[PDB]
Design a protein around this nucleic acid. Structure first.
Lengths: 306, 108, 335
RNA sequence: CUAAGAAAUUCACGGCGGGCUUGAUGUCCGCGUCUACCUGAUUCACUGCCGUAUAGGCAG
């Protein structure tokens, strides 16, 4: 919703057991809403004391490992589980299938505020790094890099460049820092135009079918494969309204009785993983919240991408 | 609900006149309220109880073990936003994947 | 009236990393940064029927027919190399601050009462006994589990990482410190002071825990076995599967946490076992029996509602158990 | 303020029984690789003498 005055690079963060089930329809890399919520929790915890705002997160995902296995005779996969403790009668409890993933991601954070002029860049960078080293990113603990060879501090780069060439060199150096990974971006325009292409191909086609067609490998008879522009993952694109926004004390057993609750349904969109050298600026990769609370639509996206 | 009352689900899902009986009981039709009860008041209470399977029962509530996730408003606010599992959408996607992976045309 | 909060959840304080397992030689433990990792391999087993028979297949003809059909499995096995008698197990522990602060709470009054109860607990005795028992369970390598059973010598090195360097190095003989006695030692008290300051603090305390076990040359190490459901599939699967991160055998973090939380020596049953893991309703998976039942007034939930709501503060041991549950975490709250 | 918060998979296992893959075989015709280039930038921080000296100086 705003252009960041600076970009803070949180380095390689090893998230231990992240929620591999991103959505009721998708598994794998966690939701971008988890990353945006983590950055908002960082702004809630240490952002206010530094007189800065932390909005917008760019994910690089340097490493992914899924705690999964492939059973013999099946081409699908299953989630490795954890043994929950027994009940009070000594019996095994009912198992809820929860999957885990070891992530290694680096985050670009959009920083704007007067506190950037009040503190050194390395000071606020080290403060938000030591705050983020005791938090969670998708349900997993963050490994804060103890007793390895060379630890990685941040590099907060001011986006108000004095010259266009110096700004370009800063963005290319920051892209070179986060090199072995893929920027995950939102593709609402690509999914909508592919929906229009399928509607010209066949009418009454929903956005779900256009999302599904952009993920399966289509085999065409003369036997070739229908190509895709990018990786084109199905991402959770936010939450849509399923109920009116009830009063803060209205909903029974809410998390807090001061925040209003509204039952939601998952919104599914198309995301794309790209090499981060294929972007004009690294501020395009930032994932922003977008509530629009009168109509539900509690989305996260990448505005100012293309 | 229970695993024994579910028989009455087909008693709300037959096609007698060519349409589903829940949409037949959502309207005050002439053939309705006479085909199931001779008395008027018994027909009214049976129609109300049979149409109450769609409306949510009890207070609006989400349990502690359910997920609740704060969402930042643009200006100074949060919404708690408890999500529910879209079992209709999941069933539709699973049906489409069944046609895609084990259908007769797909296997051909 | 101080009703209990309908959601009440606590973060996992003392959250460990996955215990990376590597191999090497004893007296080369100082240069253990380049030790090759233990790799999980596959092998085949042909056993014979040795389970109990239910008096319908005990006839000699059917039993001989069952033996005549060969029983075969594939098992994931982790072994030491035949020139490395020492198993090194390394993980990172983050002692998080705000141990008595819940993640979620409905009632503001219940949150204030719980914070006041925890604050009186820190003002009375602190986390000093609990961090002593946590430093004990770090000091003996209970997180090695079956790697600790037949080892010649186990030694635990624990390094406090303040910013990027070892702020303080502790060295413990893990076999000398028992699995069931919680005694007093100067280095153990210093580690207890550090862990209690991390629990009482606002940030986190970072520790690197490395355990060297002299199991034997080429012996079988025991990483955590992965819980994979067969789900009634037709094709036979591998019976035993292990855990690894990247060609490197590992133990699950919850197993290391369960070994770290094995401090509960205050359950109403007899302590023939010794300490058990801090669980609500005192569940022990190795026994199939749950101590600290709610029919007695010593389960975690009734102790919390007595300590917080009705102001019936229990004994100091049960207060230690309650705060150990709060450090452990969990999802509580009636409907 | 993160489909948040939470979790011990596990105990034991004999895969060996045995084996002739063989015969037979044309790779072969044909070819312009040229032109033009300072390794040297203090690039040898080197040798000896006076001085107990590692402290400090001198000579070509």
């Amino acid at each position: 919703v705003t252009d960041p005055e600076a970009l803070l690079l949180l380095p390689r963060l090893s998230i231990q057991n992240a929620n591999a089930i991103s959505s009721p329809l998708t598994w794998g890399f966690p939701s971008p809403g988890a990353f945006t919520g983590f950055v908002h929790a960082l702004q809630r915890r240490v952002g206010i004391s530094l007189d800065i705002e932390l909005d917008g997160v760019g994910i690089v995902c340097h490493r992914f490992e899924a705690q999964i296995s492939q059973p013999a005779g099946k081409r699908t996969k299953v989630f490795n589980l954890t043994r929950n403790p027994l009940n009070r009668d000594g019996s095994t409890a009912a198992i809820v299938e929860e999957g885990r993933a070891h992530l290694e991601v680096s985050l670009l954070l959009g920083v704007h505020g007067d506190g950037l002029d009040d503190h050194p860049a390395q000071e606020i960078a080290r403060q938000v790094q030591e705050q983020a080293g005791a938090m969670r990113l998708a349900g997993g603990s963050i490994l804060p890099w103890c007793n390895e060879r060379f630890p990685a501090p941040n590099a907060e780069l001011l986006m108000l460049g004095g010259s266009d060439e110096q700004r370009r060199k800063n963005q290319r150096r920051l892209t070179r820092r986060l090199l072995p990974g893929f920027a995950l971006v939102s593709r609402e325009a690509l999914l909508q135009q592919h929906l229009e292409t399928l509607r010209t191909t066949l009418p009454e086609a929903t956005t779900l079918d256009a999302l599904l067609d952009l993920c399966r490998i289509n085999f065409e008879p003369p036997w070739q494969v229908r190509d895709k522009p990018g990786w084109l993952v199905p991402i959770p694109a936010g939450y849509n309204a399923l109920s009116p926004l009830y009063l803060p004390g209205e909903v029974r057993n809410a998390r807090d009785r001061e925040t209003p609750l509204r039952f939601v349904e998952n919104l599914f969109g198309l995301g794309e993983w790209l090499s981060p050298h294929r972007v004009a600026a690294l501020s395009d990769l930032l994932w922003y919240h977008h509530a629009e609370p009168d109509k539900g639509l509690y989305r996260w996206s990448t505005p100012r991408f293309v | 609900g229970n695993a024994a009352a579910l028989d009455v689900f087909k008693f709300l899902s037959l096609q007698y006149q060519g349409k589903n009986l829940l949409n037949w009981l959502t309207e005050d039709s002439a053939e309705a309220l006479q085909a199931l009860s001779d008395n008027a008041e018994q027909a009214r209470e049976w129609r109300q109880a049979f149409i109450g399977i769609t409306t949510v029962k009890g207070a609006p509530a989400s349990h502690s073990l359910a997920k609740q996730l704060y969402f930042p408003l643009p200006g100074s606010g949060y919404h708690l936003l408890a999500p529910l599992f879209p079992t209709s959408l999941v069933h539709h996607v699973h049906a489409l994947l069944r046609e895609a992976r084990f259908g007769d045309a797909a296997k051909a | 009236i101080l009703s209990t909060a309908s959601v009440l959840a606590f973060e996992r304080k003392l959250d460990p990393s996955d215990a990376l397992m590597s191999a090497g030689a004893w007296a080369q433990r100082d240069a253990s940064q380049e030790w090759p990792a233990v790799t999980v391999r596959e092998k085949s087993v042909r056993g014979t029927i040795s389970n109990r028979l239910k008096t319908k297949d005990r006839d000699p003809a059917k039993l001989d027919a069952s033996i005549q059909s060969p029983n075969l499995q594939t098992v994931d096995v982790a072994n030491l190399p035949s020139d490395a008698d020492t198993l090194k197990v390394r993980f990172t522990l983050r002692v998080l601050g705000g141990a008595g602060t819940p993640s979620a709470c409905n009632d503001a009054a219940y949150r204030d009462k719980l914070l006041q109860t925890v604050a009186t607990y820190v003002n009375d005795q602190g986390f000093a006994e609990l961090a002593r028992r946590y430093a004990h369970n770090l000091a003996n390598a209970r997180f090695l589990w079956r790697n600790r059973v037949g080892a010649e010598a186990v030694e635990v090195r624990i390094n406090h990482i303040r910013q990027g360097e070892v702020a303080r190095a502790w060295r413990f003989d893990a076999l000398a410190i028992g699995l069931r006695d919680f005694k007093a030692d100067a280095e153990l008290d210093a580690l207890a002071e550090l862990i209690a300051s991390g629990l009482s603090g606002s940030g986190h305390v970072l520790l690197e825990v490395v355990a060297f076990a002299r199991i034997g040359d080429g012996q079988e190490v025991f990483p955590s076995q992965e819980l994979i459901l067969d789900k009634g599939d037709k094709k036979g699967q591998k019976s035993k599967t292990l855990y690894s991160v990247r060609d490197a055998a590992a133990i699950h973090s919850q197993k290391i946490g369960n070994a770290l939380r094995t401090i509960d020596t205050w359950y109403p049953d007899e302590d023939g076992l010794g300490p058990i893991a801090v669980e609500p309703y005192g569940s022990v998976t190795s026994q199939g029996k749950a101590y600290r039942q709610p029919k007695q007034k010593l389960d975690f939930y009734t102790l919390l509602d007595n300590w917080v709501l009705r102001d019936e503060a229990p004994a100091v041991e049960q207060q230690h158990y309650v705060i150990a549950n709060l450090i452990r975490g969990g999802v509580f709250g009636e409907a």
